[PDB]
Structures are given as structure tokens and as C-alpha cells.
Write a protein that binds this ligand. Structure first.
Ligand SMILES: N[C@@H](CCC(=O)N[C@@H](CS)C(=O)NCC(=O)O)C(=O)O
Ligand SMILES: N[C@@H](CCC(=O)N[C@@H](CS)C(=O)NCC(=O)O)C(=O)O
Ligand SMILES: [Zn+2]
Ligand SMILES: [Zn+2]
Lengths: 124, 124
């Protein structure tokens, strides 16, 4: 994999932490680490996804982040949990064959409007 | 790995494409794919890092993206190439032991001010 980690600031840590806690839980993802004023999500102690809430530093415009799912069931569970936590629909779980024949994904906007996806690339 | 891919808009495709072409080349990373109005960087046909240049849609604020290096030599070569292409220094190649004892990295700002890192986590 070419991506090691990413990080960005959001408006409100309480709100964003709650969203990502709920959204990423079905992927077996939790707080891999909390370094200073950042919260790092990851699996098996390896953080890859960092959010911060530095005053005035929040990202503006839409960032797209896609997380990897091992199963289509995980895609669906991410979606349900993210919506329930206040995420806004940006595309229901389903095949996206215009990308490739086995691309199965769902899209939810986070509290700052970022386009958060979970995708499985495998046939089932 | 939990990150599948990311994407965001930048101000000027010619400038950003040139920067990332130069910066990511030492990692064996090139244009894995060009889908519509986006440019996808990746290795072995698998795009992970997408940039676009939609009018008015550019990301504002600082995004941090770190790419994985297999060797410390690669970290250094990324840095030299990124600087030569007009990147701004945000941290020279070297150990960052305050992260962990084998963390070796360099940081360069892209044309839009994003904090681009290449990191090797292995002892050498
Ligand atoms: N509503 C669409 C969302 C598709 C989407 O957001 N795709 C990602 C890339 S995988 C993206 O950033 N698209 C930007 C665009 O399509 O303009 C769906 O349900 O498929
Ligand atoms: N100038 C520093 C840059 C360190 C840096 O940018 N670290 C990343 C995380 S690996 C970051 O986003 N840091 C934000 C901060 O330290 O406030 C260096 O050379 O080490
Ligand atoms: Zn996507
Ligand atoms: Zn970093």
C-alpha cells in the first residue's frame, strides 16, 4: 500500500469522534493511538487516520476518504452505523460496476461534509 | 491496511500533477489510472491517491498525507525531487524518534500548502 497515514482538522472533536467511532467500529477500527491533541484511528495498534480540532485550522472543501472492507456485510454495517450517528447519505450500499465489476461501496458525509466511503473490491 | 484511497481537489492541475509526478516517482508511483477529470496515483495499477481540479472545489486548510517508503534512501529521494519541483521544506530527511525509534521521514508542502510526507518505519 502506498498510503501510510493521513490527518486533518475538523470543526468539533466531540461530534467527529462520535461519528468515526460509530462508522469505523464495524471495520474493527478503533483508537489505535491518541498522540497529543490528535485522535488516531487504526487496527492492530497501527493508526492510519488522524483527526484534530485545532482552532481555525479545519479543512474546508470536500475531502474524500475511502476505507477498506473485507466483506460487503461490513460496507452495509458501516453505512447503517454512520447514518444512525448523524451522517448524511451520499450513496447507499451497492455495486458500482462503472468503477469495476466487483466494486461494492457506500458513501456518507461526515459532520464537516467530507465524503466518507467504505469499499469492498472482492467478489462474493 | 485500513485506507483504500483518498481524493481531493487542488487549485491547478498542471502545477500539482508536476509536483506529484516528481515527488512520487522515487517510490515507484505513477499514474495508476486517469478516471474522468481525476488523476490517480498508485503502484501496480492500483490507484490510491486522487487529485482533481474542479473549479471552486479545492481543499482549503492543511491536509496531511504520508506515503510509505520501503527504505530511508527513498525518503531522501522523495525529498530532493519534491524540493526541486518547487515544494517547500517542512522538515528534512531524518529520524523522528519522538514518534518511534525507527521513524524516518521528510515533509514537503505541495503547491496548495498540504503537508506531504514520506516515511519509512523500518530499522536500517
Ligand atoms: N453518490 C455516488 C458517490 C460516488 C463518489 O463519491 N465517488 C468518489 C470516488 S470513489 C468521488 O469522490 N466522486 C466524486 C465525483 O464522482 O464527482 C455513489 O453513490 O456512487
Ligand atoms: N516539521 C516537522 C513536521 C512534523 C509533521 O508535520 N508531523 C505530522 C504528523 S506525522 C503532522 O501533521 N504534524 C502536525 C503537528 O505536529 O502539529 C518535522 O520535521 O518533523
Ligand atoms: Zn472512493
Ligand atoms: Zn505524518
Amino acid at each position: 500500500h502506498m498510503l501510510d497515514h493521513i490527518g486533518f482538522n475538523i470543526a468539533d472533536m466531540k461530534k467527529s469522534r462520535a461519528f468515526y467511532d460509530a462508522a469505523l467500529s464495524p471495520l474493527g477500527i478503533g483508537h489505535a493511538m491518541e498522540f497529543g491533541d490528535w485522535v488516531g484511528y487504526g487496527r492492530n495498534g497501527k493508526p492510519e487516520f488522524w483527526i484534530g480540532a485545532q482552532k481555525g485550522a479545519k479543512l474546508e472543501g470536500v475531502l474524500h476518504v475511502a476505507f477498506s472492507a473485507g466483506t460487503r456485510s461490513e460496507v452495509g454495517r458501516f453505512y447503517e452505523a454512520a447514518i444512525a450517528a448523524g451522517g448524511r447519505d451520499n450513496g447507499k450500499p451497492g455495486l458500482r460496476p462503472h468503477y469495476h465489476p466487483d466494486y461494492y461501496a457506500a458513501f456518507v458525509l461526515d459532520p464537516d461534509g467530507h465524503n466518507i466511503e467504505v469499499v469492498c473490491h472482492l467478489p462474493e
